[PDB]
Amino acid sequence: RKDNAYVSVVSSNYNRRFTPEIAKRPKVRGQSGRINYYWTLLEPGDTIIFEA
Amino acid sequence: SHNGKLCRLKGKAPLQLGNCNIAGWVLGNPECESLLSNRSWSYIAETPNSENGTCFPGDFADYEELREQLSSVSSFERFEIFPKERSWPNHTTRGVTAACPHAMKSSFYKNLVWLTEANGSYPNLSRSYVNNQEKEVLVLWGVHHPSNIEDQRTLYRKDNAYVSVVSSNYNRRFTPEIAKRPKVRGQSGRINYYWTLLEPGDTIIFEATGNLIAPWYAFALSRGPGSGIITSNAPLDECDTKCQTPQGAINSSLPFQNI
Amino acid sequence: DVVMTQSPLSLPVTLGQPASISCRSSQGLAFLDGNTYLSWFQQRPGQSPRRLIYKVSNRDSGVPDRFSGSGSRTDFTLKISRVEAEDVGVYYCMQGTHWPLTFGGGTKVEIK
Ligand SMILES: *[C@@H]1O[C@H](CO)[C@@H](O[C@@H]2O[C@H](CO)[C@@H](O[C@@H]3O[C@H](CO[C@H]4O[C@H](CO[C@H]5O[C@H](CO)[C@@H](O)[C@H](O)[C@@H]5O)[C@@H](O)[C@H](O)[C@@H]4O)[C@@H](O)[C@H](O[C@H]4O[C@H](CO)[C@@H](O)[C@H](O)[C@@H]4O[C@H]4O[C@H](CO)[C@@H](O)[C@H](O)[C@@H]4O)[C@@H]3O)[C@H](O)[C@H]2NC(C)=O)[C@H](O)[C@H]1NC(C)=O
Ligand SMILES: *[C@@H]1O[C@H](CO)[C@@H](O[C@@H]2O[C@H](CO)[C@@H](O)[C@H](O)[C@H]2NC(C)=O)[C@H](O)[C@H]1NC(C)=O
Ligand SMILES: *[C@@H]1O[C@H](CO)[C@@H](O)[C@H](O)[C@H]1NC(C)=O
Ligand SMILES: *[C@@H]1O[C@H](CO)[C@@H](O)[C@H](O)[C@H]1NC(C)=O
Ligand SMILES: *[C@@H]1O[C@H](CO)[C@@H](O)[C@H](O)[C@H]1NC(C)=O
User: Fold this and answer.
1) CA angle centred on B59, ends B166 and B31, rounded to 5°
2) A33 in contact with B, Cβ within 8 Å
3) Cβ separation of A25 and B205 shorter than 8 Å?
4) What distance in Å separates the CA atoms of residue C16 and residue A35, rounded to the nearest whole number?
5) If you ran DSSP here, which 8-state letter would residue C74 be given?
6) Inter-chain contact A24–B126, Cβ cutoff 8 Å?
7) Which residue from B174, B64, B81 is spatially nearest to B127, judged by alpha carbons?
8) Rounded distance, CA A7 to CA A23, Å?
9) CA distance to B30, B188, C21, C55, C66, per residue, from C69 (Å)
10) Mutating which of B124, B127, B129, B164 best tests the A interface, going by the most A Cβ atoms within 10 A?
């Protein structure tokens, strides 16, 4: 329901903001959209914040 | 002991780049017209001080990785990926610059096309290419970063523009940046150059609303077992030796060397 | 002894085309003086053998320039750039380093 959106993942060692991109893509496995996957490793006593 | 001369190896002449480097060979520098012919070689020879590369200033993305890919290549086939006359009906394909001169004139690269507005309008662009050549295709393009907003408005008629290049292994989106820059080779603007390697059976899509230096010619690459890059100031001659150094050829059945 | 293997047994070539014969040995052929001592001979039908190549690279007097041989360690090759009508016959390789003296099997060249 919004044309502009953002994701932000903030930790004590990770700080990164992601913005969706809309374009024409070739069909892979019957789908033209994409999902980009990310990971991080939290330390003991640390906190992570997801905002979207 | 050595000959002191570059020469053939396993009956194949080397590719001698002369005063051109690898970037000026792949982009199509106007002083590198002799290298744009479809050939084969055994190893690549380069002058240690070559001054004919990217005539327009800018950054070449992953240049050393391109050198490492082009080290093990036996031959290429230069083919026209997008025709200049027919694939752009509603743009102006004529673009020259004073940073790249040919015979005391103004010219551009021989593998790239500078698209500009036609009749006061810059329509949306969307082109696709499919690979049927059964080998890898090296695709080269560029994104233009102007110096002021007036040049942007005169060339592309839009304050905001983007380029998107999408493949099955490449997915990138580029936005022009306008800033004040020092003058390099008489120009304050920049052109950033990018490359990719299509696989057989794959497709590439270029979409743009501004600031696109479109491809014109592409290279169909074939891989080989033994090749490399040598920096030399030694001259070409005729031999059939089985060892080559930057100093010269070596003919020994001896186990060691110190050259 | 030392076993020498030649490839191929028969090599039919057309006039004006290159040809190559390969000779392989079981042991290394280097000597303590610093040389290899491998020779290549030609035998025409109904005639005595004559020498073409002595040592790895040296070419005998009276031999045409189209005969060139090179190799090292255990693999050696004789190459003919242009094949003419006087290039028919059987070609052989010998070693002259180890006792006893061994000859090759022989490669026959025919014109197509
Ligand atoms: C070259 O490329 C560029 C970039 O790729 C292309 O640009 C794209 O162009 C699209 C149109 O072709 C455009 O899509 C429109 O988006 C508009 C905005 O959507 C929002 O608003 C609507 C409605 O909300 C209303 O209320 C709010 C709050 O007051 C207002 O702010 C809004 O303005 C509205 O009044 C929401 O539903 C959305 O969720 C968004 O919030 C749309 O309004 C617009 O819809 C109209 O056009 C449709 C197609 O004709 C039509 O079906 C629909 O009924 C709307 O009709 C309008 O226009 C007609 C004709 O003039 C008029 O008769 C109607 O009365 C009405 O005004 C579109 O959906 C993309 O956003 C845009 N992308 C960008 C900018 O990146 C460009 O087109 C392309 N050029 C070429 C060569 O094609
Ligand atoms: C190829 O390289 C030569 C130099 O090796 C370039 O010639 C120079 O061009 C600059 C302009 O930027 C002049 O200021 C120099 O005086 C020129 N030097 C000489 C010796 O002529 C030439 O412009 C390059 N060609 C291209 C197409 O970039
Ligand atoms: C190559 O071999 C020939 C013949 O043995 C010799 O004359 C020449 O000097 C050699 N080349 C070098 C660089 O030693
Ligand atoms: C370039 O390669 C193509 C093969 O796609 C060939 O048809 C053409 O003749 C070549 N051009 C040369 C050698 O100038
Ligand atoms: C170019 O302009 C013509 C004329 O309006 C139009 O028909 C065509 O769709 C445009 N685009 C292309 C890619 O030819």
Assistant:
1) 105
2) no
3) yes
4) 62
5) T
6) yes
7) B81
8) 19
9) 44, 61, 9, 9, 10
10) B164
Burial class (CB within 10 angstroms; exposed 0-12, middle 13-18, buried 19+) of C35: middle
Amino acid residing at B120: G
Q: Are A17 and A8 in contact (CB under 8 A)?
A: yes
Place of tokens 């070596």: B250
DSSP B182-244: --BTTB--EEEEEEEEEPTT-EEEEEESS-EEEE-EEEEEEE-SS--EEE--PPB----BS-B
**Are the C-beta atoms of residues C40 and C92 closer than 8 Å to each other?**
yes
Solving technique for this entry? cryo-EM
Among A4, A18, A19, A24, pick the best mutation site for testing chain B contact (most B Cβ within 10 A): A24
* Cβ proximity of B46 and B176 under 8 Å: no
Beta carbon of B124 within 6 Å of any ligand 1 atom: yes
Resolution in A: 3.0
Phi, psi for A22 (deg, rounded to 5)? -115, 120
